[model samples]
Structure formats: structure tokens, C-alpha cells
Target: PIVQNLQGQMVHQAISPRTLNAWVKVVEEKAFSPEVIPMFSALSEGATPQDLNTMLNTVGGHQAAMQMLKETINEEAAEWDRLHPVHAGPIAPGQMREPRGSDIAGTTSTLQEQIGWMTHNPPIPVGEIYKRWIILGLNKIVRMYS
Candidate 1:
């Protein structure tokens, strides 16, 4: 998951199906594009499966991840503009609020405090991290389901 830079604050969320589908398209396209240097290229160069596995296991793995990231963003931007008439940027702070947190000003006070507290607290588990990402992403596209 990629974090949305809402103004200055970071908002991590899961991606929408519309955006996800778009991303899949981009991924499929890029995977075949010349710039991506096909995996077969390594075989052609006499590189062994072990060598290829080692290269993929290294930090170079981020290359594949980053490519997918860019495609996902492109898909999100497309959906944002298609579903919302406004510009696909800098969503208003109020617009970013979850409905459950709206209507009562103090309802989210704990959230604000926790956000601050988290700055100094121990790191959370990766599973928890992805859960939040999935929830937030779904929230953004919930209206589309109707």
C-alpha cells in the first residue's frame, strides 16, 4: 500500500477495485514493456536460476514493488477524477474524516492524541499496518458500491 500525502500528513489506505483494476492493467503492460527488462533476458545472458533468485531476494526487489506502486497511483488518480468532479488532489481535511468520527467534534480527540502518541510508541506489527491500509482504502471507495 502507498500512503497518500494529504497536504502534509500521511494517510495510508487500501486501494479501490476500480483503481486496482487500472493498476493491474498498468502492471500487465509494464511487465511486457521494453523498459522492464524481461526475466528471460537474464536467462539469455546465461544467468542461473540461483543468481536470479539471489538478485530478486535483495533490495532490488523494490524495483518490482516500486513499478507496481506507480501504476497503482495512476489508477487511483483516474478513479478519483472519474468519481469525483473535483480535482484529484489535496482532499479537504473535513472530507478526509471517517463518517463515524464526524458530527461530534470530540469523538476523534482520542484519535488525534493517539496519532501524536504513536510518534514515540513502539512500532506496530506489519499485519496491523496492512489492516489499516485495507480499511482506509475501502472507505475511500465505499460510495461507489451503491
Candidate 2:
């Protein structure tokens, strides 16, 4: 269950900024701890609740944890941009030129065929979509953890 605290931050299981900050400090001081590396990566990649729980349960600071979260958010955004490239103009390189006569099913003119093809093939701007999802998830995590 989620609840709002006095600071008006949404919290889950009472995980707050203070707790996360404490964990961060611990990680910073004990950087050699075996768990630190994986935990950092997990949080940055938007760790699942289970992953977060394990991290919170294991070696723990607030500011450092917040820093880790910020890094993770940035990494995810950069990765998303790399995965989804936005093509300029109406046509992308290597894309099929307007359907040829042999490619058409019937008497459809090339222009009509091209229109139909375009109507069926819409561009999915997944890069931005994924970045938004990542940010929103991180926001929830920040609210709950902090």
C-alpha cells in the first residue's frame, strides 16, 4: 500500500529518502562491498521492487542512493535514444521505393498503392516513449523510496 507522508511524498512500506540516503552513504564508504556494484546497476536500470527490496535489505545512505538513481535515469535515457533512431523526412534510407507494378495486387495506381502502404506503416517513436516510461518509473521509485 502507498501512503503520503507529512512531506506529501508517496511512500511504500515506509521507505523514505532518509533511508535511501543512509544506504547510499554506506555504499559510498564500502565501495568494495560485493553487493554494491550489482545493486547500483539494478537501481539505475529501474530495478524491480524485489531488486530494490534486496538492495535496501543489504548493505545500505540517502544522498548516495539518490545519486545512484539519478545516474540510472540518465543511463536509461541515453540507451533508449540509441535504440530508437528518428529518421528525417518522409522516407528512410534503404526503405522500399513506392511499390512497383509487379508488387501491386491489382489495378491500384502507384500513388494509391504508396498511400495505402504509408497508411499501414506508421512510425513508432519508441525512443521517446521508452524515455518517458523510464522517467515516470523513476519518479515513482523516488517518491516511494525517498
Q: Which candidate number maximizes TM-score? A: 2
Q: State the lDDT of candidate 2 residue by residue for 73-128, as single tens digits.
A: 55655564466443434877656344322212112233333333333355322222
lDDT of each: 0.32, 0.42
lDDT of 1 by residue, 112-137 (tens): 43233223234222223222232233
* Model 2 CA deviation exceeding 4 Å by range: 1-15, 38-76, 85-146
Instruction: Provide TM-scores for the models.
Output: 0.21, 0.25
- Specify the highest-lDDT model's number: 2
lDDT of 2: 0.42
Taking the candidates one at a time, how many backbone clashes does each contain?
Answer: 2, 14
lDDT, residue 57, model 2 = 45
